[model samples]
Target: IVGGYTCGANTVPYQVSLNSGYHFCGGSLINSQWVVSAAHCYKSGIQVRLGEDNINVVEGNEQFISASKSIVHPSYNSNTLNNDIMLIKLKSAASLNSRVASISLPTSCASAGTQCLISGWGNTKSSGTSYPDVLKCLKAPILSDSSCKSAYPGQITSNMFCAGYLEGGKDSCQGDSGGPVVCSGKLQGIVSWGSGCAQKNKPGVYTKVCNYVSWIKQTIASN
Candidate 1:
């Protein structure tokens, strides 16, 4: 994350790392059996790394488990980045403890101006990989849909929203896709895309988690 601070060890327990050979994306452990991430992060060989604070260290509380199955939203449009949420079912249920636990989904939509927490292992670079070892976090207020539309023209959709300073410098960046955009202690959004790493007038855009709450529940129940 750009213009963010290192999160306290195990403070953001629900935050998870989506890894293959290396950490490629971030996700939230919403339940013992499921992880919520962006559909664009979908891959066959992803392993969920829970209770991870620093990527380079092997903390005893961490759990590395492979995905048993994954389901991307049927209406997900990659080109437009619409409905970009997905769920990954764990091969085995994650063991919950002080340092490893699930986060609750939002009960309602967060309105514009709500200050939310965004955290990830993403880098500060404008592009390319240069991810941080420890998780980083920033507090950005949710931007109105209209403001977001103005910021990115027609690219902003109902399934997406914006969060970050209008002046620039505090936002999620590369390698942070599918990570948490939390508000009121609930999972509110998933890091989706933006113009650049914390650029002026280009606030970070995210997958609106409120729009997919029902889909998430139904998918989990049927599977």
Candidate 2:
């Protein structure tokens, strides 16, 4: 059976299932008409599924949204994972409901040690390497700017935020990228990268949502 909710409780987000049958990662509803996720999740044969527990059981209710176009951050470099972010313009807006509502975007970046939540159907244990169908979540405390910089060295920048457990057990594992990193009921970040799954001294890195507010607003408006 699926476990209880941890972070972003009672809130269900959308996910993209790759052609290989593996659910790559999750996405957040940025507006009544737009959804946000990682650029890496965009690929051929990728389909979006919302308002479901497990991908397998919820395929029928899954909504198909053709990504009319993809906009990768101009500064984004896959090699260094710089500016790792993207927006999915659905063919049609999803019907909002209790289980399917949009998350608010942060107006500014969060300070160090801010509490946040991460959620997905990703692997629960570090030893495993596959994503589950049932949705799950975990709580995370934002890492200090100095600590994050020290851990990642030259990788972390002002455009990113770090959150995870320093003890090496809890974290957003593989297949959890592009998911929400919510704080105070608003989306403050997007899962980007980390050294390893649940590794000590290594917290999950996310794209700072506040950094792209203007771009997001403009993109959605023009779309």
Candidate 3:
């Protein structure tokens, strides 16, 4: 996350890293055995690491586990990047402790102007290899629906929402995709896509999690 601060150890326990050798994307633990991330981040051999603070150094509290299955939203359209959400079932349930736990899902949609927190290990700049070892977080306010549509004409959809400063300072970048966008301590969105990292008038777009609450519940309950 650009223009963000390092997070304290276990400060965001629900935040997790998707790894295939190294951190590539972030995810949120919705339950002991399930995680929510961006569908675009999916990879066959991806692993999930929970309670991680620094990827380069061992944090004792970290729990490394493999996925049992990954279920991307059926309606996910790769070309249009709509419904860019996915659920990952862990091979084993995470043992809840002081440094590992699940976060609550949103029951209602977050409206424009709502200030939210975005945490990730993505690039710290607009472009380059500046991924942080320690997780980073920043405050980004959700942009108005109309304003978001104007920024990226023909791209914004109801399943997605934009957030960040219009002046361009803070936002989720590469490697941060699939990370949690938490508002009021609830998972509201997942980092999806954007025109550029923190570009003026181009806020980061996220999969509106509230819109898929039922889908998540139904999917988990059935399978």
* Candidate 3 residue lDDT tens string, 1-223: 9888998889998999999999999999999999999999988998999999998899699999999899999999999999999999999999988788898999789999999999999999986667688999998899999999999999999999999988997889999999999999999999999987988888899999999999999999987
Candidate number with the higher TM-score (2 or 3): 3
Candidate 3 local Cα displacement, residue 53, angstroms: 0.5
Clashing pairs in 2: 54-133
RMSD of each: 1.1, 3.0, 0.9
Expressed as tens digits, the lDDT of each residue in 188-223 for candidate 2 is 888888877888888788888899999899888887
Q: Would you list the clashing residue pairs of candidate 1?
A: none
What TM-score should be assigned to candidate 1?
0.97
Specify the highest-TM-score model's number: 3
lDDT of 1: 0.92
After the best TM-score superposition of candidate 1, give how far the Cα of residue 143 lies from its true spot, in angstroms.
0.7
lDDT, candidate 3, equals 0.92
- Please identify which of the two predictions, 2 or 3, would achieve the higher lDDT against the true structure: 3
Q: Per TM-score, what order, best first?
A: 3, 1, 2
Distance from true location, Cα of 33 in model 2, Å: 2.8
